Each structure stands twice: as structure tokens, then as C-alpha cells.
Amino acid sequence: MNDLNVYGEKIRNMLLELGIYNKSDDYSPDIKYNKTFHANGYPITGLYKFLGYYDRDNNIANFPSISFTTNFSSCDVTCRVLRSGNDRIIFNGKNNEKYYKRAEKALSFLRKKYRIDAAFEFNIRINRRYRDAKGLGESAAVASATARAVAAAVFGMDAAKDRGFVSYLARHVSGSGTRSAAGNLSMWLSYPGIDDLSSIGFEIRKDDLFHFYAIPMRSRTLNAHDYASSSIFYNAWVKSKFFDIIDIIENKFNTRMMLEYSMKDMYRLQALLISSGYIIYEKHYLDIIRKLRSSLNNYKNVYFTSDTGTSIVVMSTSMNELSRFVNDLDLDGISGNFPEKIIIEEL
Amino acid sequence: MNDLNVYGEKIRNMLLELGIYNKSDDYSPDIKYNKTFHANGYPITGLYKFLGYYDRDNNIANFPSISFTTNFSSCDVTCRVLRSGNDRIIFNGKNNEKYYKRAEKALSFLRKKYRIDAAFEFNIRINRRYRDAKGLGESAAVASATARAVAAAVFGMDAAKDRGFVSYLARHVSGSGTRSAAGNLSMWLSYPGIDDLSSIGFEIRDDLFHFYAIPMRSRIETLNAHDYASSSIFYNAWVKSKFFDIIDIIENKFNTRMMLEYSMKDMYRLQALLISSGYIIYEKHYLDIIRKLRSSLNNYKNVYFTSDTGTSIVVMSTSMNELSRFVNDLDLDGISGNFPEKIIIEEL
Ligand SMILES: CCCCCCCC/C=C\CCCCCCCC(=O)O
């Protein structure tokens, strides 16, 4: 779309003027064969949420998104590049066709764009702080950790330390990986017609953030993109996203505005899914959201959100108000924090 | 440049060319003072659903709608016109402000348009086949019954038997009233800028369907749902798609199967509009029933279901035997529906 491109480009110019965004630099492969590289990565929770791709082959989104990086789980990846052989993708000790299929797609991009004739061995470890739950942004943790390990092995440590370049690589695994690779509070710039190296994540800041807590819940995510995109309301959502992104940039990413927006956006996201016949709502989720909504008026600056799942993230600018809310409502979840250490190393 | 008025006028011309729609005829008052008139009226269930008004004072909707008339409740109205005296509006034995206000908005239109200097006595009786359920189109039953009684008393039996004219009067009580007054399967033509006597209900038809309701309790009042849906950021996209969907159903000659399937899709879209504004229609029991219904639909041939601005569900089928087999297999605890067979309009 031409009007969407115009608004995307306006957003890009505003970000270039702020100095927080730059088109990513590109690198030439200099493969360190037979050496194991290790990297970690963290999941994300959406504030300005994302659903639907403009170009699903390159993972270009229809509009920009904003998330924060959490510690609800952690991913660690081991990568080894071989001159010959077959790719091996191990996920939590399992060698299943499902994981292979998702990996070989980002590796296809890598081999075609950079003319690489090599085999890849990946060992992915995700440690969750919950037994089972959806919508806690696990795919962003895998995408950022795999991108960091591949960047170190294929391009070198200099490239692996370049957050823009690593977000570019992470995007090819999962769109949300752009924001996990970039930092703790980050934005992914994306819109129709954007150049490949311009559609990346970048950090907004590492100060004046907030407190958060998750209520992990079971739900009956790649289908969420198709379901939302096919909604008759999808184009109206995409259009409003450009105006909302412009407004948050003009408001200098004010914390409380983003927290409030994330609550409104949770409802809009659910509405898009509902309008396509996908009911995200489960009985237990309904009981918790009614409890949460009913009590919000009695708290100051307490907000909550959900993504494509029933897990809820409760957020507040005050740690005491958050803990008071969690205790009074007897919520049984996990305390969150922004990760402090990104590891990228040759083993 | 009003795009909704353009698509509205295109729809109107298509309907004129089919010969199923005509601008309503108007009538001069010839009041039969001191005589009691009695009429009945029935609720509706939306197929091409309606929410939000373009002009709330004249009850002009933003787009056209299609519904069917049911027997989930019934309304009976008694009307008497007096030369002098005061208006009296009794609703289920109650004389409350909320009812006087709703009746006065319509009577003000009647007195101003037709230059009537008279008092009106209305006695409205609504008998429901459920307790506390929402979204079963009760306001259409009151609107059609009151319009039939007023048309007989104020304009005469000839005007009361003119379904177009009666739907025009019913619109001033409740928009959905146009469809209830028009017949069992009907469309209300409405869009921004439409002429007053053109915004009426008309009967589509012969080859209908069977239905069954599961009345359920809900939080959101139908009157508030108009404001809630209208305030959604998705409302304009819904309105726009409604014009294209109405053009498509007219070109498909109101095919039953297509309208039943549309009503299922439209139920999701309606819920989405309410959800996007932060209004959750869902309840735990509704969730359990809709999951049971959705899970079994693939095993039935012509079975569909819908809901309006409530948790009440209406199950529909082109076959009575398939519907009863569906209701029995899922052990549904609701009420059997039927299209009303007798419309009463009488003096005394
Ligand atoms: C031109 C026709 C004029 C006649 C107008 C009179 C009709 C309006 C009266 C009452 C509206 C009733 C709406 C339904 C009430 C439900 C309220 C409840 O049950 O609590």
C-alpha cells in the first residue's frame, strides 16, 4: 500500500532525526568452521502489538511494533558450522521435523543471500519458569539467541555485537526476534515497501522503566497471523497502528502511555481474532480478566495485557502498588525482570 | 462526498428494479376517537445484523439490515386516542418514566408531522418465554405492535394493513421494528441521507428455515451496545463491509443458506466490535455452550447458529429433523422457535 508506505517512511524519518534508529550495516561471511559458539536470548511481551506479515517470506510486518524483554524463560543456543554434512536442529534434547522445518527457512535465506555452502548444528535450550503457557513470547528468545550464535559463527564477533545486524538476522527466524535482539525496551520498524536492512529492531532506552508480573495460562500463534490478516477489521487496525506509533514517538515513549496503550491493544488484538472465528477466551481466563478489570479502579498505574494466548502480564510504575495488587487479588504467577546480561561467546 | 449514501442509493435502485421494495405511501390522519384498537407484534433475530444509528432522532441506521421474526416473546398492545386528556403509557402493568420517554419520542414525531392534537392511552403487554435473557429482539415486538395499533386508530384499517406504512411508523419506536412490522423474513433499507418514507422494512418472502433459542444471561444492555459498537475503531470498517455484503446478498437473491452462514460470521464481527471497545460479552456458561456448538457443526449439514447483543444463541437449520437431532445430541436446554402465524389488528 502507498499510503501505508508514506506513513512508514514518515515514522522512519522521525526515528532517524531522534538518533535512536539507523539502517543496519551488512557483513561479509568469514566462517569459523568446527568451533562451537554460544549465545542467550530472552522472550518478549508486546506493548504496541504485532500480528500479520506484509511479506511472510522475509518476515516484514505491515506496521511497526514495540515490546519489552522479560525473564519469564531464557534461551541458550549452541551453534557449530561444518564444511559438509547435514543440518541438525536439537530443541530441548528433541530432534523433531517441526523444529527442523522452522530453522531450515531462516538458514535458506542465509545460504541464498550470502552464498554459503555449509551445514549447521544447533542445540537450543529453553528453560521456562512455568509448566505450560502460551503468549509469553518464547519464539523471540529462540530467534535472538540463534541469531547471535549464527552471527558470531558466520560473520564474527564484531557482527554479533552489532545489535542492528543481529536483529536483522533474528527477524528471519521470527519477527518478534527483532525486538528481543535489540534490547530491553525496543521497537521494530516495519511497513510495506521498507528495505530489507531497514526493517530491524532498536532499543528505546535502558532507564525509567516499570515493574511487571506474569500469570502463565494454558490456551488452545503462527495461525494468529493468518486469522488476524483475514479479519475484515485488519486494514482498520493497520491504519490506526501508524497513527498510534507516530503519537508515541511524539510523546517520547512515555511509560504510562505505553502501559495504557498495551491494555487497549490487548482488546483490539482479541477482537481481530474473534472476528475471524478464533475464540482466544477460556473459562479460567474469563474469571481472571473479570477479577483484574473489576479491581483496576482501586489501584494507581496498574495495567495488564495479553498477547496471542491466555497468559496475562500485569505492569506498574510502582513496585509496592504491583505487589499490593498481586497479593490482594491472590494472583498465582511469577515476578518479572528485564534481563541484564547478553552472552555471546566462542566455546 | 458521502460514500455510504452512494452505496445506499445503489442498493435502493437495485431493490426498485427487483420490484420487492417501494418508497412507503403516506396517509392523512382520520382519527377514530374513543375506540380501543388492539394489535400484536413479534421479536426479531438478526441475520445481517444492525448496530448504531446515523440519526438517532428519526431512527435512521448507518446501513441496511435483514432479520427474521420469531415467537420467543409476544407483544399485545391496546391503543385509544382521545380528543383531550393526558398520555398514558402502561408497560406490563407499570407506569414508569423510562417507558413514557421512549413512547413520547415516537408520539412527538406523530404529533409534529401529522398535526395531531390528541391524547394517547397505550397498554403494552410483553410475555417472554424466558427470564433475564438478553439479545432476543424484544423491542422490535413492541415497535411493530404499537405501530399497528396507532396506524389503525389514527389512519384507519387500510393504513394498518399497509406493511410499508406500518414499518415506517414502527421505525420511530425502534429501528428493528421496521423488520418485525414487514413480515417473517425482512429487510430494512437504511443509510445516511435516505428519505424518511424510503427507510422502511419489506418482506423478502416461501423457502424458509427452523430455529431454536438458548436464552442466556448477559451484562450489556442492547440500547448501550449501539454506543459501544459505534465508538469502536473497527465500526467504520464494519459499516463499509455491510454495504458490499448487502449488494452481494441481493445479487444472490437472498439465498437461505448464504444468509444463515452470513449470520454466523456476523455474530463474530459484532462480538469483536464490542470486545475492541473493552466490553466483554462472554460469560463462562456461554463459552461452554459455544465450544460445544462449534465442535459439533462439522457433523451436521445445514445447521448454523448466531447471537446478537447478548449471550442468547439462536440455532437454525433448513431441516426441522436435522435441527431436532442437533438439539437432542448436544442435550441443549432452550426453547423451540417458530415464525408467527397470526398478526392481529382489530377494533375492540
Ligand atoms: C408511532 C408509534 C408510537 C407508539 C410508542 C409507544 C411504544 C414505546 C413504549 C415502550 C418501549 C418499550 C421498550 C422495551 C422495554 C423493556 C424494559 C424492561 O423490560 O425492563
Numbering used by the authors:
A (entry chain B): 1 to 220, 223 to 349
B (entry chain A): 1 to 205, 207 to 349
Publication passage describing the model:
The enzyme catalyzes the elimination of the 3-phosphate group from mevalonate 3,5-bisphosphate as well as concomitant decarboxylation of the substrate.
The X-ray crystal structure of PtoMBD was solved at 2.2 Å resolution. Two protein molecules are observed in the asymmetric unit of space group P21212. The PtoMBD monomers comprise 12 α-helices and 12 β-strands. The α1 helix, which does not exist in known structures of DMD and PMD, is formed at the extended N-terminal region of PtoMBD. However, no detergents were used in the purification and crystallization processes, and no other molecule in the crystallization conditions would fit the shape of this density tube, so we concluded that the unknown ligand in the cavity was likely an endogenous fatty acid from Escherichia coli, which was used as the host organism for recombinant protein expression. Oleic acid (OLA) fitted well in the electron density and therefore was included in the structural model of PtoMBD. Interestingly, the binding site of the fatty acid–like ligand overlaps with the ATP-binding site of DMD, which has been elucidated by the structural studies of DMDs from S. epidermidis, S. solfataricus, and Enterococcus faecalis.
